[PDB]
Write a protein that binds this ligand. Sequence first.
Ligand SMILES: NC(=O)c1ccc[n+]([C@@H]2O[C@H](COP(=O)([O-])OP(=O)(O)OC[C@H]3O[C@@H](n4cnc5c(N)ncnc54)[C@H](OP(=O)(O)O)[C@@H]3O)[C@@H](O)[C@H]2O)c1
Ligand SMILES: O=C(O)Cc1nn(Cc2nc3cc(C(F)(F)F)ccc3s2)c(=O)c2ccccc12
Length: 314
Amino acid sequence: SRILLNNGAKMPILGLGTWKSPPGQVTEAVKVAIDVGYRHIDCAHVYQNENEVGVAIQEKLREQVVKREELFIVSKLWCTYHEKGLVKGACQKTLSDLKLDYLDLYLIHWPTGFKPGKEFFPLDESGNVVPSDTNILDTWAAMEELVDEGLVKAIGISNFNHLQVEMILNKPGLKYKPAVNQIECHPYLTQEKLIQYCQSKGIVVTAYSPLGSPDRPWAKPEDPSLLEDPRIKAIAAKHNKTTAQVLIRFPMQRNLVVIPKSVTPERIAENFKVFDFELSSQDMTTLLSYNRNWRVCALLSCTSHKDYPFHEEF
Ligand SMILES: NC(=O)c1ccc[n+]([C@@H]2O[C@H](COP(=O)([O-])OP(=O)(O)OC[C@H]3O[C@@H](n4cnc5c(N)ncnc54)[C@H](OP(=O)(O)O)[C@@H]3O)[C@@H](O)[C@H]2O)c1
Ligand SMILES: O=C(O)Cc1nn(Cc2nc3cc(C(F)(F)F)ccc3s2)c(=O)c2ccccc12
């Protein structure tokens, strides 16, 4: 149920996502999750609910349902903090909100730096995001210092394409390799090329939006529905499991970590019940065949950033 990272630590292959979890409901969602067995929580400052996640974690530690060493807590450096001088402060705010004295993993959330300020998405008068003149290698060095200071046990990246991964790997004076690349991944966006690249470099891949993020605020009704894909439902039926459970088990069997989000206690529990069955090799290849290169997570206003990651093939 855990995978070995290149930093020597073990990461649970199933975690709870918290993007879009309302602040008034996420405390209970994370308490329920830890009660039913989750030991990995995926967080971010930009999700604006870390204080409330933190309440849950702290309460379960206080109740001795879990000890700190058994938890694997992940957070992410937001785009407006890529400057070398801001990275520590961003990490300590996340730590302060989560009521932790270290993070198990801290990720560069997106490869694109934006102008620092109070705005998460600073725009110019015509709507383009205002970039920062920070490059991912200086940002990376600043992340490495967090390891040396003991604020984080591992560092990694997210939404980096393979040329941007390669840039870090080739960084002159590279001190800690990224441990994880967290990317969008589901049967409509299977990422075989990027995943193979990352794994071949011993970088663990975490698959986000594994259910297709049907609650993403920019969803359109024309938009496909993984959960309602009758081919996926048939595979679930074959296994006496729900479609969500198949969608969660699928990345696990490609040696990925996967982080489904839910604030519904029945679904939190359901999503955890994925260790009692296995998809066949043929099931796996069939699921891979549904790839559409359909990406649910990105943003127009950022398309001219120099470091925009999805122009590349992979
Ligand atoms: N690094 C990045 O840039 C990045 C980007 C996107 C996401 N992520 C991370 O990955 C997580 C997961 O991705 P996501 O939030 O985009 O979406 P997701 O996990 O693919 O989908 C969550 C949606 O599915 C619903 N759902 C959950 N379990 C279900 C089940 N068993 N049956 C039916 N519906 C179910 C949830 O509903 P309820 O909550 O109402 O139950 C919610 O509407 C995020 O929360 C975040 O932690 C990271
Ligand atoms: O980030 C989350 O975890 C989920 C997430 N995704 N997106 C879609 C995005 N698309 C991007 C594209 C770039 C780009 F690199 F391409 F420029 C940079 C940054 C982003 S945010 C959002 O706009 C967002 C807003 C608030 C909280 C979470 C999110």
